Amino acid sequence: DEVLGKVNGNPKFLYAMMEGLAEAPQLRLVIDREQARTLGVSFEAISSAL
Amino acid sequence: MPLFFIRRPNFAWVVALFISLGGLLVIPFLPVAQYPNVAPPQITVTATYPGASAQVLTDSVTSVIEEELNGAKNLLYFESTSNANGIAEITVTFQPGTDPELAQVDVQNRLKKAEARMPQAVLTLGIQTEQATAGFLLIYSLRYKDGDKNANTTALADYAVRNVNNEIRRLPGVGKLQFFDSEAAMRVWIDPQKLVGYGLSIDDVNNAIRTQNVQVPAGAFGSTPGSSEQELTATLTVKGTLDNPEEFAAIVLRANQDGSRLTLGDVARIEVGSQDYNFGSRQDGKPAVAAAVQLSPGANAIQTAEAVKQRLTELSANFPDNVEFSVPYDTSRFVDVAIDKVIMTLIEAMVLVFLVMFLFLQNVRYTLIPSIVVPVCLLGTLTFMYLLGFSVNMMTMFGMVLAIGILVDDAIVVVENVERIMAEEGLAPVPATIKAMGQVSGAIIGITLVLSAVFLPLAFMAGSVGVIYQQFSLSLAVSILFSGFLALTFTPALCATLLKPIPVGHHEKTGFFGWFNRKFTSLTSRYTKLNDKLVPRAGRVMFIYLGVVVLMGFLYMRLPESFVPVEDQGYMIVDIQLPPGATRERTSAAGGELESFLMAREAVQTTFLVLGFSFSGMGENAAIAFPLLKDWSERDSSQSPEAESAAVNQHFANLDDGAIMAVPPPPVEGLGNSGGFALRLQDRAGLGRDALLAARDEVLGKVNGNPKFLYAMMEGLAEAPQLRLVIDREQARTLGVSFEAISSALSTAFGSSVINDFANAGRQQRVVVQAEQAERMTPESVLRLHVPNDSGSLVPLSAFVTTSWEEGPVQVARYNGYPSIRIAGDAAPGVSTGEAMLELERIAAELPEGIGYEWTGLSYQERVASGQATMLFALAITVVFLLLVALYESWAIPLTVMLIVPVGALGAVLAVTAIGLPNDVYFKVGLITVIGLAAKNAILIVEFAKDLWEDGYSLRDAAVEAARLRFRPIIMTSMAFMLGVVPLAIATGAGAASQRALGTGVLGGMLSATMLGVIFVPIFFVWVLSLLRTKP
Amino acid sequence: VVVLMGFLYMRLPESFVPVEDQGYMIVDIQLPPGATRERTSAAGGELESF
Amino acid sequence: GASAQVLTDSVTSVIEEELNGAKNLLYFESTSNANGIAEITVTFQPGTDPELAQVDVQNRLKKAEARMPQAVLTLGIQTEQATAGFLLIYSLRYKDGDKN
Amino acid sequence: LPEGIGYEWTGLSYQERVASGQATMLFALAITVVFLLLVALYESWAIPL
Ligand SMILES: c1ccc2c(CN3CCNCC3)cccc2c1
């Protein structure tokens, strides 16, 4: 963003833009490994199922 | 053709300036290196089988790859060695001059064909093929300033891999970075006693690690094919792998419904450490790391070395303050010193030829011409050398320094002949040039062709000698080709242009110059009378000449042969081998004492020590040291590497823990681990390991007792006691114990098992599981291990395994597919290597039938060289004869001139025998260029002799006059070449052995070819034209 | 004349290769982060209609 | 189904790091997308035969193969020539223009 | 930019860089070679100038 602000505000170029995908919201899955294990759930089962 | 240029000087000027401009525009792409790829192209296979014995790895992995790599195009041989550390080494060697890329890809193709058979452990660890020998530019090292012993080399190695190695491998010119150490890895040090307490087996901990430390490709909700309604796809990014030891210690081994859990840390100590602990490196008593940087093909060395050093110093700014970098070894410093000295010799030889040029002609303008025509030839030499893809290495710089002499003669004779005509007839410069060049041009073409074809054959031979002679001879030949072209076209124009008229009759002179003119006139007249005195007695001079050729033969056959003189490379080899079964700590103590003593030696600037590696073989008992010597300028002869090696061997002769041996490095890199002879004792019939070792002691008894050899030792690891585990399979099974459980438990507890991938902040390293240091130090610890039965209890190992000791191979060596012993050594001082090879063949003939013997590397190439030299000489002689009969329109005149070369050979042989140097390659090429000069001399006499004797002069009068008017340039060029190559023979420092072997041989041979040739050649002329009764 | 030549030679903007009319164009369809394929298909539908 | 960062540090990182030092490299670009496709482009100096480039890159992918996940391996890694004299593109489409 | 952030050119920019680098001494070598051929042909220097 530093370089893009310094560039797009500079009239020496038509444009500058990330030829690349912008950051996106993600959904982290907080797996209590201990809780899942105590219920008898292997991490292998969760990983395979997901 | 020269007259064309005499009438049009600008044409010749432009052609010469053209070739010069080409030369100048070709240097910026010059490849430089120590030596060319003289060593054969070697590919080396590295297969890792953690915790597998030498024999297991031998018959499980390396045997299969060896089977697959047979019949590959361009094989020369292949060596394999399987060490107890679990690393297999297979070195496939090809004929020199074969492109290493094609060798590499073919070896990879055959490795793939083999890949289906190696165990899962090797495959998951990966098989690596690379190029063990190449232009390894340098080695750069990192070490701790404080010299703390407790320094964690793994943190240093991780810093080097993350920050340093990538930058250097990114640099231009470097074709491969060889990091010579391990990589970080979460270590899982399990305690089998805790596993016993918790009713857990090692497979349980492995499977917990395997399923709980796995990345999770969860995906993203709202993914294609998506509903026409939903519009918010997003990633699921589950965390699956573990980053730090704390997370790994939280791997749940067994959790109850109540809430109680068993985490990995409760049974194992978790830390980040080396993936592999086979090898350790030390630099000057401090734990250090190092990497081998190798030069890409067809690239400058000095520029690449400077780029690496500048990059590394720039990185040293971001370095941790406790760590410091240094570059102990650099192969570009030798080349920088070499070219800077050779340039100095070139300038100082130009000044010498200028000085004697002006001493003879006593006028600067006459002297100028060669000083301009010579570097033009040198620039053309560079352009053509680059065009064929040769490299600017020491051997081409000797091509330079001993070309300068044979090149300078063209200009010397041309300008000196034009002066002789200018003085004796006094014409204007142009018509005098016409006359002299008309006399000399056919002879000059004969020269150019005959020396072209005298070093053409030296370019035909194969082997490492093949490469040396290739470069050195072809540099010489291109030099003489352009020198002849200039003498035909450009230099005559130079005479027609730059020369100034002299007054008629101005032979009276003021000062010591007039003394010189008078004294040389007296010498020329005296020599004229001398010829007039011997030419009647030609049959009698036959007896002296035959004595000369017989003496040449006598000391030539009395001259010990050699491949290449050993050069002071500034480093030594010291081998650290302890008794069989030695732990790394004993080796570290031995290395500590060795490195301390090397500190006490002032001849050593820095000592680099390797633990676990030695050219004999890799193992815990084995280690190697590479002391670095100070620069030659800061050292004297008393601190030469050989003297320092003797000092160390005498010092550590009474070492109480193992053996320390100091061996000077082999002369040619990549042709072996030490100089001398390399012999593989095969068993072409399968007599068995014990029988092969029996033959080994047989041959070593028969050899070490023979005074023909300095020493001979098994370049390999001695047999070590082994602990065979007698597992009652039936008993273990009845208790409910599967063999799978025992095998898995042993492999994981003692051999360490790589479970899965540790995602260490972007690097995929491998979590390793191994038993605790205290729980695997003794044989009883093997018994204390437990394995699970079918009923869920844990069965101690000692319930069904009894340990019985026996003896086995810690290293197995195979050659061309058969089991072999690698025996190596050096001959006694003052004894030829060929005689030692013959003695070894004789002794090996006494071996029991079925035991084969095979030479390898240096010995094999010495063999092919000695084979090829003879018909090389023969082809050279027959071709020079044929060209001579072509040019001279006769047969008698060709034999007349060919009578000259024994005198040059005699001079070279007597000089080298007086100084005692062997019959190395450098002396051989010095001899051939001396022969070339003598042939040039002989033509320079005899073409004018023939010209006179076709003009009506009497045979004796024609010969004597020809010698009289060719005497001056003869001694002229002789003295120029003298003082041009005198620095070569007196050379000291880097590469000095090669330069001295040149200088002494060339100086002696050319000394005889002048002092004896100038007298004998007219005698030969009159004899041959008399006895054969030749007619004009 | 030679000075004039130099003066507008150094005043001449450099270029690699002039852009040729290749008969095709590039149009990029990038939606906000986390966009399902269906939104992109609707955008492409409107683009292709135009 | 592997995220951008997972594919980044699990597959494309290993191949990327291992292909360094290859003969005639001019640079190499890598991009890892959430779709689960890793994209690595290795560019060589013009005038080098792309047959030798292709074979060397395949030989290096071979050294990399030992580390990729089982999913990628069973699905397979593919190396080709993204830029070449692509003569044309030919297409098949439905006349009726049915969306379904 | 803050120290540690490196910049690099790729593809078209890299080629434009090397082209702009080579143009000058290419022109120079062309001029010197034509001069040399011209002095060869004309048996003079003044005529080549
Ligand atoms: C100092 C340190 C290493 C040196 C090497 C490396 N060696 C080959 C590869 N295996 C390790 C040993 C060769 C030659 C001179 C050296 C000098």
PDB file of N, CA and C and ligand atoms in Angstrom, chain B residues 132 136 139 180 292 328-329 571 608 610 613 615 624 626 669, ligand 1:
ATOM      1  N   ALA B 132      30.063 -34.433  -7.497  1.00  0.00           N
ATOM      2  CA  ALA B 132      31.002 -34.313  -6.387  1.00  0.00           C
ATOM      3  C   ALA B 132      32.230 -33.504  -6.770  1.00  0.00           C
ATOM      4  N   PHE B 136      34.709 -26.325  -7.800  1.00  0.00           N
ATOM      5  CA  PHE B 136      34.217 -25.796  -6.542  1.00  0.00           C
ATOM      6  C   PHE B 136      34.954 -24.497  -6.258  1.00  0.00           C
ATOM      7  N   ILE B 139      34.854 -22.403  -0.342  1.00  0.00           N
ATOM      8  CA  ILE B 139      34.021 -22.804   0.774  1.00  0.00           C
ATOM      9  C   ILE B 139      33.961 -21.638   1.746  1.00  0.00           C
ATOM     10  N   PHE B 180      27.255 -28.314   3.564  1.00  0.00           N
ATOM     11  CA  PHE B 180      27.854 -29.530   4.103  1.00  0.00           C
ATOM     12  C   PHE B 180      27.532 -29.669   5.590  1.00  0.00           C
ATOM     13  N   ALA B 292      30.081 -25.747   0.383  1.00  0.00           N
ATOM     14  CA  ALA B 292      30.930 -25.794  -0.795  1.00  0.00           C
ATOM     15  C   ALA B 292      30.221 -25.126  -1.958  1.00  0.00           C
ATOM     16  N   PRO B 328      37.712 -19.687   4.297  1.00  0.00           N
ATOM     17  CA  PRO B 328      39.037 -20.308   4.412  1.00  0.00           C
ATOM     18  C   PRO B 328      39.657 -20.670   3.075  1.00  0.00           C
ATOM     19  N   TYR B 329      38.924 -21.353   2.200  1.00  0.00           N
ATOM     20  CA  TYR B 329      39.473 -21.808   0.931  1.00  0.00           C
ATOM     21  C   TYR B 329      38.823 -21.048  -0.207  1.00  0.00           C
ATOM     22  N   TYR B 571      46.780 -26.285   1.469  1.00  0.00           N
ATOM     23  CA  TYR B 571      45.977 -27.043   2.413  1.00  0.00           C
ATOM     24  C   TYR B 571      46.531 -28.451   2.476  1.00  0.00           C
ATOM     25  N   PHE B 608      40.320 -26.283   9.608  1.00  0.00           N
ATOM     26  CA  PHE B 608      38.950 -26.737   9.455  1.00  0.00           C
ATOM     27  C   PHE B 608      38.910 -28.240   9.638  1.00  0.00           C
ATOM     28  N   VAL B 610      36.553 -31.829  10.202  1.00  0.00           N
ATOM     29  CA  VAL B 610      35.288 -32.506   9.976  1.00  0.00           C
ATOM     30  C   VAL B 610      35.264 -33.747  10.848  1.00  0.00           C
ATOM     31  N   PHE B 613      33.347 -37.625   8.885  1.00  0.00           N
ATOM     32  CA  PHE B 613      33.699 -37.788   7.481  1.00  0.00           C
ATOM     33  C   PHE B 613      35.200 -37.950   7.365  1.00  0.00           C
ATOM     34  N   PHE B 615      38.097 -39.417   4.037  1.00  0.00           N
ATOM     35  CA  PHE B 615      38.203 -40.038   2.727  1.00  0.00           C
ATOM     36  C   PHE B 615      38.315 -41.549   2.827  1.00  0.00           C
ATOM     37  N   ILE B 624      38.178 -35.987   9.530  1.00  0.00           N
ATOM     38  CA  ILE B 624      39.181 -35.447   8.621  1.00  0.00           C
ATOM     39  C   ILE B 624      39.455 -34.000   8.988  1.00  0.00           C
ATOM     40  N   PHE B 626      41.397 -30.318   7.507  1.00  0.00           N
ATOM     41  CA  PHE B 626      41.911 -29.592   6.352  1.00  0.00           C
ATOM     42  C   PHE B 626      42.564 -28.315   6.858  1.00  0.00           C
ATOM     43  N   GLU B 669      42.715 -32.239  -8.655  1.00  0.00           N
ATOM     44  CA  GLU B 669      41.472 -32.362  -7.912  1.00  0.00           C
ATOM     45  C   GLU B 669      40.538 -33.294  -8.664  1.00  0.00           C
TER      46      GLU B 669
HETATM   47  C1  LIG F   1      39.071 -27.264   2.745  1.00  0.00           C
HETATM   48  C2  LIG F   1      37.795 -27.797   3.017  1.00  0.00           C
HETATM   49  C3  LIG F   1      37.215 -28.736   2.120  1.00  0.00           C
HETATM   50  C4  LIG F   1      37.921 -29.141   0.947  1.00  0.00           C
HETATM   51  C5  LIG F   1      37.342 -30.095   0.032  1.00  0.00           C
HETATM   52  C6  LIG F   1      35.928 -30.701   0.310  1.00  0.00           C
HETATM   53  N1  LIG F   1      35.990 -31.931   0.266  1.00  0.00           N
HETATM   54  C7  LIG F   1      35.247 -32.460  -0.812  1.00  0.00           C
HETATM   55  C8  LIG F   1      33.775 -32.729  -0.514  1.00  0.00           C
HETATM   56  N2  LIG F   1      33.591 -33.385   0.734  1.00  0.00           N
HETATM   57  C9  LIG F   1      34.175 -32.631   1.766  1.00  0.00           C
HETATM   58  C10 LIG F   1      35.675 -32.498   1.534  1.00  0.00           C
HETATM   59  C11 LIG F   1      38.047 -30.481  -1.115  1.00  0.00           C
HETATM   60  C12 LIG F   1      39.314 -29.939  -1.372  1.00  0.00           C
HETATM   61  C13 LIG F   1      39.861 -29.030  -0.496  1.00  0.00           C
HETATM   62  C14 LIG F   1      39.142 -28.623   0.696  1.00  0.00           C
HETATM   63  C15 LIG F   1      39.746 -27.656   1.617  1.00  0.00           C
END
